[PDB]
Design a protein around this ligand. Structure first.
Ligand SMILES: [Ca+2]
Ligand SMILES: [Ca+2]
Ligand SMILES: [Ca+2]
Ligand SMILES: [Ca+2]
Ligand SMILES: [Ca+2]
Ligand SMILES: [Ca+2]
Ligand SMILES: [Ca+2]
Ligand SMILES: [Ca+2]
Ligand SMILES: [Ca+2]
Lengths: 389, 195
């Protein structure tokens, strides 16, 4: 295609109907996207690169971008833009900060990607879009927050890195077909960073949620210290008496005080270092018929309890299945007051230091390496081992 | 056709007698339609795009537009212009505000279209022209008022949208072959807007 340059004036630029690219840089440190600029693309390999020392603020008066598929926005300071109008034909919006805030809203049909280096105490906030991606590094105090005002059409994919000892500030997501928030911690060898509190709240499209963190450790001479953030996952229809509920699978990779609340929940995938998981099902008044918790574990270790919060005063899971996989897992306490069957399966040892499951009528290990239960079984309770210790 | 740019100076621009377009944008945030500017079109695919951060205030001294069929005027603030003189050969005048007043008068023979977003307490007033069209959204207190000083040659077609609970301010039309005023109300689900 052909390559077109914006000036500090009013530009009227029209593409070839081909692979053409539009440059909106600076001239004497004066912006080149300016009042009245009108840009026009043609065929579908169209790119606008907007680069400015100055903070992006808004689209300027009389500006119309049209027929351009990818918009790249890079600023020496903050970005604030909304692209649900003025821009038409836009499939992809990418916004880039280094060391300042971001406050972006995309139209549905547009894939947002908000990359931020050295986030520090600055806050990222994004809304709308089709698939959204947040990629934040050098994080510290900064909140990350998605879909607070408008959810994504497609998937959310946050990821956040911190090197600081000062702790990773909130992360909140609302809505999306599937959500992933991936924290890391990269602090120094004799320090403790405590990681970010996460909240995901599904809209009625949210089938899956994933919340990974760096594994906890005790600050040593040559051991980087990490504490884990609370996680709170909530489905739309969590408080409803009648509405279905959509969150089916939840994946965790380390966690502090974790919560799930979904009447559509069947699977939980666990991994790394945990404090507590509390599973509630939606406050549906109807007596539930499918009551099978699948609980796939892999390298999981728990300070405290996996609890079925719903079982106590309401209708919990009757059958729990635990599938240990590729690495040893240890659950300090498993509390499942409505549980009937317990089948431990798979590939690698599952250890349950202490269960509290009074209504259990049978336990059945089918696992290769074996299962160990530290609590003394009920005198009424049948147990069946498989191969393996 | 060809595309011609006005400068912060005095321009003497002459079109190709073809699909040509005239740009009267900004230079360093300085207006380019300025004193003595004279523009000339040729054949009938001629457009003048006048875009300014600053309020449009009137046509500047010695400015003459000629042989140009469509005039688009867009401002970051108010528009006040009259085009019954200086301008000849103009079939279509379109004026565009977002969040400030409009006070426009067109020559007969020219189809006026006054589009205004987020009108709020600002007042639109238009006069003269052939067919006039007012297209106002986000309205509130703002009066809309047509032909108070000079009627249209052709049809009036107002339309006004309000999202507010504060009530939609007058609409008056005088004159025209046929008149339409189309209000809407788009207020929230537990509020009352009176139109
Ligand atoms: Ca420009
Ligand atoms: Ca093209
Ligand atoms: Ca295109
Ligand atoms: Ca409940
Ligand atoms: Ca219930
Ligand atoms: Ca019960
Ligand atoms: Ca011409
Ligand atoms: Ca000039
Ligand atoms: Ca002409």
């Amino acid at each position: 295609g052909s390559t077109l340059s914006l000036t500090t004036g009013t530009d009227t630029l029209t593409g070839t109907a081909n692979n053409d690219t539009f440059v909106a840089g600076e001239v004497a440190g004066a912006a080149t996207l300016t009042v009245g600029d009108t840009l026009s693309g043609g065929a579908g390999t169209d790119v606008l690169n907007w680069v400015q020392a100055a903070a992006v603020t808004a689209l300027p008066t009389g500006v119309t971008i049209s027929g351009i598929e990818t918009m790249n926005v890079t600023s020496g300071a903050a970005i604030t833009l909304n692209t649900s109008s003025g821009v038409t034909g836009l499939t992809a919006l990418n916004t880039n900060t280094s060391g300042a805030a971001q406050t972006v809203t995309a139209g549905a049909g547009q894939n947002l990607t908000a990359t931020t280096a050295a986030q520090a105490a600055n806050n990222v906030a994004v809304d709308g879009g089709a698939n959204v991606t947040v990629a934040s590094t050098g994080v510290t105090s900064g909140t990350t927050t998605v879909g607070a005002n408008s959810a994504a059409s497609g998937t959310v994919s946050v990821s956040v890195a911190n090197s600081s000892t000062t702790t990773t500030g909130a992360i909140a997501v609302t809505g999306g077909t599937a959500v992933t928030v991936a924290q890391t911690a990269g602090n120094a060898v004799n320090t403790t960073l405590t990681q970010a509190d996460v909240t995901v709240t599904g809209n009625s499209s949210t089938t899956a949620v994933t919340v990974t963190q760096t594994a906890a450790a005790t600050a040593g001479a040559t051991v980087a210290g990490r504490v884990n953030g609370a996680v709170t996952i909530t489905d739309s229809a969590a408080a409803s008496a009648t509405t279905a509920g959509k969150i089916a699978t939840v994946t965790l990779g380390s966690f502090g005080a974790a919560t799930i609340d979904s009447s559509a929940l069947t699977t939980v995938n666990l991994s790394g270092t945990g404090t507590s998981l509390g599973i509630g099902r939606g406050a549906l008044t109807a007596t539930p018929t499918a009551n099978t918790l699948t609980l796939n574990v892999n390298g999981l270790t728990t300070t405290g309890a996996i609890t079925d919060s719903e079982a106590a005063a309401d209708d919990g899971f009757t059958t729990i299945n635990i599938a240990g996989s590729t690495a040893s897992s240890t659950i300090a306490s498993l509390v499942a007051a409505d549980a009937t069957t317990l089948n431990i399966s798979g590939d690698a040892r599952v250890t349950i230091t202490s269960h509290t499951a009074a209504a259990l009528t049978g336990i059945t290990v089918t696992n290769s390496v074996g299962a160990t239960l530290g609590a003394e079984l009920a005198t009424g309770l049948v147990f069946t081992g498989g191969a393996g210790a």
